[PDB]
């Protein structure tokens, strides 16, 4: 689908509210496998199961290993920009 | 594949 830019607002006591799978070592993108109800990703409205996360706050995740992506994603705070695409 | 809750 079209590449989308999506804003997410997270408080410091919360996670992103997603589960991710995939990663470079598996030959697939970082993919959203779950959106957890009521948590920041669900609340932001623009992130969905099946979206590939191409970048977060300008950091490209297209060639990142699974655990690299976890570290990068979990470091982001506050107003967080995502670049995503549903394929 | 691995799954991480984040």
Numbering used by the authors:
A (entry chain A): 284 to 370
B (entry chain C): 5 to 10
Could you share sentences copied from the article?
In previous work, we have investigated the binding preferences of a PDZ domain that is known to interact with the C-terminus of the cystic fibrosis transmembrane conductance regulator (CFTR). The result was iCAL36, a decameric peptide with sequence ANSRWPTSII.
In order to test which positions can accommodate a modified lysine residue without a substantial loss in peptide binding affinity, we substituted residues at the P−1, P−3, P−4, and P−5 positions of the iCAL36 peptide. The structures of CALP bound to each of the substituted peptides were determined by X-ray crystallography, for comparison with the structure in complex with iCAL36. For example, a P−4 acetylated lysine interacts with the CALP α2 helix, whereas a P−1 or P−3 acetylated lysine faces the opposite side of the peptide binding cleft, and a P−5 acetylated lysine can access either side of the interaction pocket. Thus, although an acetylated lysine substitution is slightly more disruptive at P−3 than at P−1, there may be hydrophobic pocket accessible from P−3, for example, which could represent a target for further peptidomimetic engineering. Thus, S−1 and S−3 can intersect and could potentially be bridged using a cyclic peptide, a strategy previously employed in targeting PSD-95. Relative to iCAL36, there is little change in affinity for the P−4-substituted peptide, and the P−3- and P−5-substituted peptides are the weakest ligands.
